[model samples]
Target chain A: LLIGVATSSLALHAPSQIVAAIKSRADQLGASVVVSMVERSGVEACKAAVHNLLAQRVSGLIINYPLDDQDAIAVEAACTNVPALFLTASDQTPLNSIIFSHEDGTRLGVEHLVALGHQQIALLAGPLSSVDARLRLAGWHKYLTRNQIQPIAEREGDWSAMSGFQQTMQMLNEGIVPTAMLVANDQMALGAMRAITESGLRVGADISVVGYDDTEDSSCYIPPLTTIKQDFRLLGQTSVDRLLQLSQGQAVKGNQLLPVSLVKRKTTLAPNTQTASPRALADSLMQLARQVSRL
Target chain B: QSLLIGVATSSLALHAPSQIVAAIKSRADQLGASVVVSMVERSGVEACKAAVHNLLAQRVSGLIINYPLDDQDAIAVEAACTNVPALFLTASDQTPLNSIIFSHEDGTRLGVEHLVALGHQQIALLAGPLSSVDARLRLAGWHKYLTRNQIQPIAEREGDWSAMSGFQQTMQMLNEGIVPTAMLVANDQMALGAMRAITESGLRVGADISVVGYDDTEDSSCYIPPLTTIKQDFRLLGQTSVDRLLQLSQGQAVKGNQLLPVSLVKRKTTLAPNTQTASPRALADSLMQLARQVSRLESGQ
Candidate 1:
């Protein structure tokens, strides 16, 4: 039997990373996997892909970045007794969700920016049509309201590099400047950084940026993005492994909550640090890097 | 006689360069002088020297060089056109060689005056492309107002005058932990990127840190929060260049530096410092703690 995968978009790094992990594990189980890329994770595309995968008569299916509750429920019912596992925790759905605490991750990210004394943080939040999307938004809203730090600008993106890039471009084109942006994901963060540089703003200096999902190359980002780190390898392994078990007369494990860490590198700082000329900052960064590098 | 103008710096696509060139052709036509203009796409010293050589070989009587460049490049052009009265336009036209330029000091003074009037005490200057005379003049103006007020201004940095370069310079400052109450950008284009950076840093632009742009481009007024800046009439400046080059052709002794006036156009980009602070120690401790946390995570902790 085949194992089919459906995710929002492969244009983003995070979705592809999880999909790769899912495929590798499926290969070990002697099952071939087919992937469907849903543009913007539209509900119609999500349902269509899941139904298509089910038609392949796969042993089971894995879903990543699915559209919210009713969509997940409809797809789950369509599976017709075939085990359906979700990458993100579907709200009020019986799918074996492979997700960490969304609220917890956003809380930590917003709190970190607050503690850094950022008053005008912008948020490139995820789409409101997903389960984790609302959870992440809830946490973000709660933390900002509690801290009395007003969100300067809030826009939604489809968790793609182009979305972040376009959203930031819109903000800058109109001259709606923000000092810090707490990004929804590393892919969008990278895209925002591209717009930032294009507009003649610095990632760490002129504005501070924070990201979620400390993907593998987050450190390589110019100024090394400060992000919320989590290990998805184990999540993927457990997910597809459970799907294989369901193919047999074996029991599948309950849902998993992965571990997360706040991985701060660069790209975050207190406001009003442009007092030092950019030249001096470069000289200082080189010195700091040298001092850290030699020993 | 065909008056050859060596157009340096390939920003001809931009409004400022185009305006200047248009004025040159118009004024040259009116003065009965044939105009031969060479626009270099990323023209350097060698390209400039070659253009001058070719222009002279064509038996051009007068030569005009744009964007008064570095002394070495200026020196090379002067060597080629000493016998043919050469005029420099707005680059570094300050010597007896005759250049039609704006009051670099006055333009910067206007920007600084706006910031100072905004109650900004801590100020930083990120310069424009280092090659432009306007860039150097703006800094001089920046220092004049700053020193006159006895405020020790922050050390300055230079960018290529692109919005992206300004964005880069600002990023380096943040990475190095530099914060100022106000940022003085070199031009409107750089200000476009600087405003985004300033806003992205979680500081309100007009309240937390005042920002001012030089070279009031048309887009400056349309900025999300309209940009306050110094305005230079490039058309007028170009008109003057043609007038001066014609005078040079007539063997009339023209002043080496014609300091034209500049005006200030106020918008929403500048504001007084909001006068707020968090415990620096708290932030310091956080940075250190964050580094430790990142290290632990990377080490598989």
Candidate 2:
């Protein structure tokens, strides 16, 4: 039997890993796999790819692209005779789904920071429009509220190192210094770390930072990053296994949730009681300001 | 008649391969041609040959392969493409088939010249896998530049083009006490690791040490001091490769390997040697002053 995997972009970290996993897993199961990639923007391209896959008579379909309500319904209608599984996309679709627990991942990172005695925790969230980003943001807010710790400066980035750099620089320029920061992804975390260093503060010493995704480069980050790890390989394998089962006329679960873990590295540490206090933080901000003036 | 092109690529998770594939697909669409991409799970020659066979079975008009093939694999693939024209994205072992490749000599010269212009005589290298054709060419380029300039070579470390390899290589170099004033890393991701190693060693990038990376990846500008890297026009490379392959498919003679040009991106990472190696106290004092002025301006607003 043949399985079709539809994703708009293989350029991204998560999508690539997931697709690669699906291919290998399908191969091991003695099934063939075909992938259709489309431009991120055109719904027409999406429809075309689906139609092309149907022409190949793919026994099962796995859709990873984000879809709106009307288009989702259209796709659902198109897949009426085909078993389809939506990955981290619209819940309104009648097909089965698998969702990554982004909120749980965020909570794990925030909890790690909290355990390190971080009170003034800041957040660098992904674009608010993304479902994963909102969930992560919610986790940060929920965890901080439950811990009775007031949230500090929060900024948004478009899941890029540049955005992270810009947002962190903006926060520093506004004098909103925090003991630790939780960046949405490792790329943004890299940028945030750079901004912290440019301000003449040591990353693991003066400021603690945590990143998500645990990308391949995360461990090589300056001082290495303390972050959350999503098992992308597992996510991919699960998708393949479930889709194969459904394709074989077996009933599969409606929705599946994957777990995330925390990777402790050199980046996070307990704050210095004396220097990390609110008054001390203000003094250091002033000190940094003076240093900038001399420049 | 519309054409059908088959693309076989490996390491789709990497920036270069993914970007190239994306460009190929876009160009194919604009030309009213169709493309089917077959991804090899690994960069092995066997996997590549299998992909090539699969693509041929699909009755594709032309083939675009992103993986580097060895002499035997190259011949096998060539034999398999008797009816279809194949374009290898990178250099293969003495292959006569058409290909699109970067001018590693010029690319390396550009990076080395930038470092030399900054008065960096002790320039080191973080190279890619020595077995790779691209890596060997880049190494040769670096050596040729240094010999012509009459600058004694410092050290060379190899990487597998991963961030961890770069970090580990850099760490080893630092631990061995071979600290060069400037480094030319093979790619942007490895350069990030090298930068991290430099930072971990209590040295500052763009000052105590400088780095120039290849590929000029998406995150280069967001490096701590940002990275000064050599920019390879992957978009142009992809578009040109597609255009040429399509021509070849139409029985148009396209000869010789196409070499893409690379240019230097002047970013914050490359700076004059020892320019920012000032006393930490003095540097901190100056930065503190600037920070104060900025804070005052912000508060006033």
- Identify the candidate with maximal lDDT: 2
Point out where model 1 deviates above 4 Å.
Answer: A1-295, B1-15, B26-34, B41-44, B58-61, B90-94, B131-133, B253-255, B275-301
Tens digits of lDDT, candidate 1, B1-301:
2343333323223434544555565555456554443333345666566556545544556766764466556666677674787777645533645666777778877888778876778889889766666677677778888898787677578877666676678767756778888889887767766666766677656666677887775445545455788888876876777677667777885646667888988776665566333224333432343443333223322
TM-score, candidate 2, is 0.86
Looking at model 1, residue B277 earns an lDDT score of 38
In the range A10-115, model 2's lDDT, one tens digit per residue, is: 3655666677777778667877676677666646767766765675567888887766556665676677588888775434435578877766887888789899
Query: What Cα-based lDDT does every candidate model obtain?
Result: 0.66, 0.78
Cα error, candidate 2, residue A137 (Å): 2.6
Worst 10 residues of 2 chain A by lDDT: A272-281
lDDT string, candidate 2, B203-229, tens digits: 978778899999987777877667899
Distance from true location, Cα of A10 in model 1, Å: 43
